[PDB]
Design a protein around this ligand. Sequence first.
Ligand SMILES: Nc1ncnc2c1ncn2[C@@H]1O[C@H](COP(=O)(O)OP(=O)(O)O)[C@@H](O)[C@H]1O
Ligand SMILES: Nc1ncnc2c1ncn2[C@@H]1O[C@H](COP(=O)(O)OP(=O)(O)O)[C@@H](O)[C@H]1O
Ligand SMILES: [Fe+3]
Ligand SMILES: [Fe+3]
Lengths: 328, 328, 195, 195
Amino acid sequence: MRTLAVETSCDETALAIYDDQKGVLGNVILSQAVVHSPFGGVVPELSAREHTRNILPIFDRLLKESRINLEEIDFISFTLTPGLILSLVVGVAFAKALAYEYRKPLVPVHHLEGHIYSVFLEKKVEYPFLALIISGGHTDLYLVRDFGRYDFLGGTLDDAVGEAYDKVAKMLGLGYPGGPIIDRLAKEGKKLYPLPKPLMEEGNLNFSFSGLKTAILNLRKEDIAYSFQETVVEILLEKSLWAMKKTGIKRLVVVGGVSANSRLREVFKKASQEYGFELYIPHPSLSTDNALMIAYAGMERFKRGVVAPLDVNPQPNIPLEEFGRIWT
Amino acid sequence: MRTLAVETSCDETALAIYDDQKGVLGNVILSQAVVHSPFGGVVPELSAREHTRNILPIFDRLLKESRINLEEIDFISFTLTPGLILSLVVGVAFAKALAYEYRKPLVPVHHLEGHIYSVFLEKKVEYPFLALIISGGHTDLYLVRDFGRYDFLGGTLDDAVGEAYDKVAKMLGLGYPGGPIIDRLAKEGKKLYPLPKPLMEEGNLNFSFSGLKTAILNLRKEDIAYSFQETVVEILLEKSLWAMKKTGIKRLVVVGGVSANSRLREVFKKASQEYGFELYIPHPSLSTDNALMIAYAGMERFKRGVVAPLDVNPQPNIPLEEFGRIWT
Amino acid sequence: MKILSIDTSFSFINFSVIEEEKVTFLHYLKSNKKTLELLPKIFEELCIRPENFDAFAVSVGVGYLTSLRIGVTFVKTWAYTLGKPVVSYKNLELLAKKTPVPFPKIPYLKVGSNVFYQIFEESSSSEVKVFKGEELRGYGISLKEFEDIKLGEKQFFHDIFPFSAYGGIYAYEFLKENPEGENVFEIEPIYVKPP
Amino acid sequence: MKILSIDTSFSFINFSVIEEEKVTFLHYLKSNKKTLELLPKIFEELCIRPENFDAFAVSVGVGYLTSLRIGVTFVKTWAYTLGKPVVSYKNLELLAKKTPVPFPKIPYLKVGSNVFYQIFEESSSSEVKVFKGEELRGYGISLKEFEDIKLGEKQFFHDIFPFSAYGGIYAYEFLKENPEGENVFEIEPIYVKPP
Ligand SMILES: Nc1ncnc2c1ncn2[C@@H]1O[C@H](COP(=O)(O)OP(=O)(O)O)[C@@H](O)[C@H]1O
Ligand SMILES: Nc1ncnc2c1ncn2[C@@H]1O[C@H](COP(=O)(O)OP(=O)(O)O)[C@@H](O)[C@H]1O
Ligand SMILES: [Fe+3]
Ligand SMILES: [Fe+3]
């Protein structure tokens, strides 16, 4: 079985071809970090224009590298939601263009569903399992009981972790994508100046990070990165440990772009060794947005007999739990 | 069961409503004889314009007289062929207009098929039977084995009987519809000046009439009408007797506008009394073109499960035998 | 109000829906099929239902007479049975009024072997004439289909001029001051020549 | 040659087929549905298949940018994969060239809160500007949809002006002298304002 997958939910144009017997047949991505960097953020209209310019050159590269014919693709997988609606429609337009032209089914995927299944590309995870999703705009815990069956357990009450890195990096004047800059800079710190905890009670599975910017101002740049990162990663691990104890589930999937952080990976790996739970974190190239994870979740949905009609329409934010009920 | 029937094959605009339990519910006809009379014939383009002007007023009269609702009609019957193509399309357009508007089936009828079933309105004829069809442009003998199953036995090798009346009436300077004028004038004749027979051999079931115009010129106006009519009706009876002997069939249907002739009716009735065969001739109002006979044949075809598609197209001349094979 | 407007003058058959004084639907097909092959199947394919309309509009030409008779019969039948108003419209009139060239305006169309034309001034117009080569004063107006035919001192050819759209907009305007429409029994193709 | 021409500039989405240098098909629908709700379902309903065409044409506006991006992506994808030429076209240019009023010609269209206009002379034209109330010299040209908006000294409003038809005729002419068409990777909506 074989799918061409399309991801344009945010600021990466990503196409991939995945075969469930042969594995990856193609994988091309163009980031828009260069063009959004003068704004300290992602400008929606600008992102839409870049997707429109870049999607055809990327496709050309995918076809030449993979040497696959579209006639050999069984179905087209694509990110329907959530994301920047103006960018989403470019990818959906391209997918439906190909689907109608080649008479292939359409299979929608939720973007966070892609992140969950990003680890399945290397190893299948037994159900049920916990998923910690940590991206630029999400910091969520879900209990995954089956494909399409995601129970929301908690999420951020203010900033997601990725945004917190961005604000701390800007606040230190360093550049924007904040995560990788802090990850690298924190290796120098050594001295950890302690930081305050949120006001919610222990055992709550929700997250809070934006108050650290208050304590950062109220306070050795490499030690600043070090102390921020250490507090943040420790928050993530504690909430996950609480979630495993509350649920009884000793399988944890950690995904999203912040799952590429090298110190996060140290801490969760250490915890899996000391506590005896199973941990799945993807290769760093699958932590950040890619179409291969979309392709994998598309396979799962297609194999259950679910396809979309030709008039299927993207939306900015369908919640993951609702999406899985609707689409499987 | 109930049908609205539409007939516009030549120079009469005819609509009718027929119920197979209650009989005739409506019947309206407008003749174009007045407008075609200055031409000694039927002008096609002119006929098409008259149908277009007259079809809606006729329909209005049909609806007010009958007091039927179109919603109560089960299917629309209509003459598809043969005829003047420009006139045919007006009736077909009107039928398909109503059929699409009221979501009713369409049931095509061959015009000579209508003439055959014109006698069934008064009495059903057992199969098989012979049909002598005598109109303005046809003088045919058919062996009817079943509805839709018409074996061609013979027809005119030059003029049809109706045309022969028209040429003889004009040749005498009298007016055009020739038949009724000669029928009435011939009652005065008394003295029958004999006329020559065609050159074909006895027992042949084809017809010839145009050579009489040669002998008419080569020759007491009321005796002229009388002698022409007597020769013509005698030809028709002889060929029919030959057809019954050739086939073994002692049931004869005589239909078409010339079957309204009062002397024809005398002669065939006399022959049925003397020879002992069954004869069916319609009321004179059903001899000439009407939509009731179309309605009856439509009932027969609909009851066998045959309907036409929405794009059905009229044609100038599908032969009766071929038509019945195609459409039942 | 929602008007179904039909044009069967030429092989480029077309129909429009008019609402809020504007065209909200137009379907235009150049086809070698017979008019009765296309109607009413093409309506069923496009889910066009006569009971869904408040009013109807139809071209009376100039155009091919048998396809005009067919289209006019479809529309009269629907308008009469549904008790809805109907408005007729003239192709050559629309070509003159909607083309902003100076007067005199010479709209023309070809039907069979005849080039029919009509001469419009600001305040008056001629009868529909048959073109016989004469040198005409003024500005010819026609369709790209007839680009090879030159009338008048200069010519404008419309790349496309779907009569059912312009006719339907006109019908909408017409029904504002004359909401009863035109007499449905009297709607007929324009006949330039006799039979 | 047979060209599929598409226009997604406005809510009156439309597409045309061009053959023998003329429009043989046009479908025009004013709809409040989202562009991706209509495409490509509306093609399947009308049996329009990209492999049946020798070439493609698409509007780059001016128009609503997200629906332009969608339509341009559909067309670029088909043209690139089938190895067929594609030609872009500009709405304001077509409105000026096809409207026989005297120069200067001021075509204009409204997108959201902006009235975009462009000034054409016989031999030159301006950039696409944004209208701010100024008193303009010359003849405004627009659509009946925008009849309430007055630019220039006099105005002409087209009852209907389906850009995909005029754009497809233009594309046909274009491919006669430039049969390779335009670079498919470079086709993009016209952006008047920055992000
Ligand atoms: N090495 C790293 N350390 C910390 N955060 C990182 C690292 N690499 C990427 N990130 C964060 O991941 C986020 C992007 O994740 P991704 O899932 O691709 O984004 P989204 O799905 O939100 O568009 C960015 O906020 C970035 O700062
Ligand atoms: N009383 C009559 N005597 C002889 N012929 C008649 C008489 N009445 C009608 N006809 C003939 O019938 C013909 C019309 O028959 P009909 O079947 O209505 O015509 P068609 O089907 O050919 O249009 C005319 O030629 C007419 O002369
Ligand atoms: Fe992501
Ligand atoms: Fe008859």
